[PDB]
């Protein structure tokens, strides 16, 4: 329409006139705010065979103050976009404004609680509120469109605009048209794609006003019950997706914009380890190949890398980790078997253009395989080849099943295996069998083993096939050449020539076999060997792989290695690889260019041998360095009381008065004389403090209070210095009604109720019209027994300045309203010389909140990617306490002793300084009259990785400075 770089037909996207299968992973830059590690992730994605990444922008982080857009420093999108270009990864941009994403407010800044209009609607007050954000973020996206030589190819307006309620006329076409025009007006010309939460046809082409260019939808078919990771409920595998697609948007390529790549996990949940078992390699091979059965052309996995909900950016139901059980873990490692499995499928799609031109058929329980226990969905092509996705009919089945295939080919139909034996599908597995598969002019008539990759080189073609252990396979090639075994044993390999073909049968073995037929060499692998193969693009005009264009895809090499192969480039007589290693690794390169005489690995010349088949071999030794981590308990811990409010000399005269008689919140009208909704006064994040002044009659007995901080929140109440009690919190409670007994008060004297409330983050806004993001935080109701409500005059604070937030570098959400946070003591080099020496492991002997500070040096070796973790002990049932940990001023742990489950908190390099000084600031809130302490506090590490990554630059870490706007 508006440009010619990205077009489409009913089958696929075209980029620069060439078909491409978009295989994408979701990655949120705001959850990993270190630019060098962003490149790390992009390179890990590219090594999967993927060509795309989808990303959200979190409005709440970049317009914390209305009218001040700040997407600078750690929030700058431009380095993120340049990292993608550098890695050769296209981008799908999803700036919202509404993103959901398990983020606070679902992306909405807390000041939307004051907007007089329905959120995600055509009400002018909402639309007006979005204009400044979108005109900024969309302009930045516009600058980096592929039309300008950038990486961005698709744009998503809104997010899951799918369900409405409560008076809204859903779907409102005026609303979506407006959101679409905002993007266009900012210079976005690439196609717009939506992500319907279910296949409901919302905003599909042909729906008139508000229609997007390409209809997309989402799917999380395995659900989120991470507690039972082996349970695959009956009927949960989608079977009707192509049918739905042909009804809802037949003129556009089939797109799933969010397909399950993991799961969220709430406070009190089973943990992301369990989620990684549910969405493991078996889920991938069955469910992802099932999406290929619908001829999916655009496929984005949510998430490919989850990262961390640092600095309170997450929604109330989730905790600090957003590991998500995804293929790349929170600490950026790719050890999970699901990464390697995903790599196999991703690399298959990258080299199989006939997949996109084929005609998909209906699934069948007969006619292709000889048992109804199997289901086969065919994708038929004449000249361009066919594809057959095989799985168990009951998809949850762990049975081993013998079968034979009857498949059509250009050479006529054939019953396979022709030479004897049977095929096997073992349990939770799925296969894509191929017929008439083009290996650069050589026709593979059929193969039962799955294709990993193939390449054409100067001295021949190479094809890499794999099967699971215990499987027999067969292939046939259009050729009059015989077959020769050129590596490995000839036993298990059977063969026969016909007049225009050669047929070869084999059993999967842990030992590789290589066979030769004419100029085609075929590697026959087991799945676990195939896991160690890589297909980097080979650059000949620089060091960067470039995007996955057909010419650069064709010019790739095949590398057997270990943990990771990032890049490859040819320079003079040198073949350069960049790779990471977590063990001693034999490296083999297949398809070494004719001109290459030396091998370099990460810039170092590396001895190699050449075997009789022309394969380069080398060894890279892994010798982990001494990692010296300080013992956090032995540091010089400095303590200050960060609840001075409960001492009798505290002066709150500078605090904002909670004196608004009308709320600006449209969702919930006041049930108190003045608003005690935190967001009415610009406080949207972290711990909140309320102070209630009154004069006693002498006859007060109880104080009742309804506090609300979101799921798993807690609160604590004092009358002057006297602790009244706490709500220690439950995931099930987002608010709590408590009645506290008061001590004997003296008639005529003034007293102050101090209330501390944990704001877990603002609610999402999933249903349009419900306005749940407006759910307030703070105090909803109170009753001082025998006194009118107006007897208490309230003051409150959250983060200092509220929306005029102090820390422009670390963002609007990082710090809450504790005295120590207000003063900025959580930053590097606080004024702690005169403070008391006391450790969080000694802790508090009564209810309250302590603030602890210590520095420590690190001196970790260059060239090693070492994941570090903060650990808080929980070996036995603890008393109730809450902890926040700030690392160089950045909050990277929120901990609830009685709820969990997180005890291990990763902190990335860049936030931590691996060769320099670091600062820990710990808040410890005891919700128990007997106080509380940390059982243990430890730094740890996991497998050091010898890495190709460059120096990781430390992000800006502003040191402590006296804040003139503080209340002292
Ligand atoms: C890739 O990235 C991943 C995500 O970033 C990363 O996974 C994370 O790794 C960290 C660090 O290992 C994990 O934290 C640890 O979790 C341990 C508990 O889980 C283990 O045990 C379970 C029960 O059997 C298993 O279910 C579980 O397996 C599952 O999860 C695995 C991933 O971890 C996965 O591979 C499997 O497939 C499976 O799904 C798992 O094996 C926990 O024990 C551990 O705490 C100890 O270690 C800390 C030091 O590092 C201490 O600070 C802490 O106090 C604990 O140490 C104490 O306990 C041990 C005894 O059991 C002793 O060995 C210690 O010396 C110490 O003992 C003292 O204290 C004891 C009291 O507890 C006492 O008994 C002793 O006398 C003594 O006083 C830590 O929390 C985190 O959970 C993982 N996160 C996720 C999302 O998975 C992965 O590591 C990365 N991989 C690589 C290679 O980089
Ligand atoms: C350096 O980097 C390397 C990557 O480049 C990295 O290597 C990778 O390391 C991970 C582990 O961190 C490997 O994944 C594990 O592999 C385990 C071994 O099995 C694999 O290899 C075998 C051959 O050697 C294969 O036969 C095997 O295939 C079989 O099993 C598959 C998976 O179950 C199945 O799909 C196949 O069809 C086939 O049947 C497999 O390929 C593997 O056992 C382990 O699986 C468990 O953990 C996963 C989560 O991490 C789960 O998703 C999975 O379901 C398994 O869970 C079981 O074990 C857990 C304990 O960890 C429990 O929590 C679960 O409840 C469950 O336990 C039940 O069953 C157990 C088995 O009987 C039993 O013990 C329990 O009692 C209970 O009944 C996981 O997939 C990965 O393969 C490696 N990748 C490569 C390329 O090599 C290396 O580790 C890094 N090194 C360092 C030092 O950091
Ligand atoms: C340190 O160690 C200590 C000691 O071991 C750890 O303490 C343990 O922590 C556990 C996890 O927090 C805790 O278990 C929980 O107990 C409560 C009941 O008091 C229960 O609600 C929890 O189970 C639900 O919630 C979790 C998520 O928090 C879900 O994963 C789980 O599936 C359950 O979900 C249900 O309730 C939710 C809230 O209502 C719903 O959203 C959800 O849909 C589901 O609701 C259905 O079922 C409900 C009934 O279960 C029903 O009401 C509703 O109508 C729906 O049908 C979980 O059992 C242990 O009690 C606690 N143990 C001890 C001895 O104290 C501590 O966590 C550790 N700390 C760290 C940092 O690791
Ligand atoms: O990590 C969850 C992820 O969910 C996306 O929607 C979740 C929502 O959508 C499904 O299709 C289905 O309707 C529901 O079961 C499910 O809750 C969301 O778009 C994304 O931002 C994130 O929240
Ligand atoms: C197979 O690939 C070769 C070389 O790329 C090409 O010339 C030919 O058109 C392809 N054949 C088919 C049937 O697609
Ligand atoms: C093809 O090779 C096989 C053994 O690999 C052999 O049995 C057969 O005779 C060969 N065919 C011809 C025509 O040489
Ligand atoms: C919003 O606007 C209407 C019309 O001006 C007004 O009557 C109402 O009081 C407002 N509501 C809130 C919560 O500000
Ligand atoms: C004080 O309170 C008690 C119980 O609330 C009540 O019975 C009594 O009337 C009150 N005394 C005065 C002087 O108001
Ligand atoms: C607390 O009381 C209020 C007002 O009576 C009620 O609306 C709210 O639902 C109650 N909260 C809980 C957690 O029961
Ligand atoms: C209670 O605290 C306030 C200040 O927080 C103080 O001014 C007042 O005198 C205290 N009351 C008593 C009875 O000590
Ligand atoms: Cl202050």
Coordinates of C-alpha atoms and ligand atoms in Angstrom, one line a residue, residues 382-385 436 438-443 454 456, ligand 5:
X382 CA 3.7 -30.4 -7.4
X383 CA 7.1 -29.1 -8.5
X384 CA 7.9 -27.3 -5.2
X385 CA 7.6 -30.4 -2.9
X436 CA 10.4 -33.7 -3.7
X438 CA 14.9 -29.4 -3.5
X439 CA 18.5 -29.4 -2.5
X440 CA 19.8 -26.9 -5.0
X441 CA 18.8 -28.8 -8.1
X442 CA 19.0 -32.3 -6.5
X443 CA 15.6 -33.7 -5.8
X454 CA 21.2 -28.0 3.5
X456 CA 25.3 -25.8 -1.8
Ligands
LIG5 C1 15.5 -26.1 -7.3 O1 16.5 -25.2 -7.0 C2 17.3 -24.8 -8.2 C3 18.5 -24.1 -7.8 O2 18.2 -23.1 -6.8 C4 16.3 -24.0 -9.1 O3 17.0 -23.7 -10.3 C5 15.0 -24.7 -9.4 O4 14.1 -23.9 -9.9 C6 14.4 -25.4 -8.1 N1 13.5 -26.4 -8.6 C7 12.2 -26.4 -8.1 C8 11.3 -27.5 -8.7 O5 11.7 -25.6 -7.4

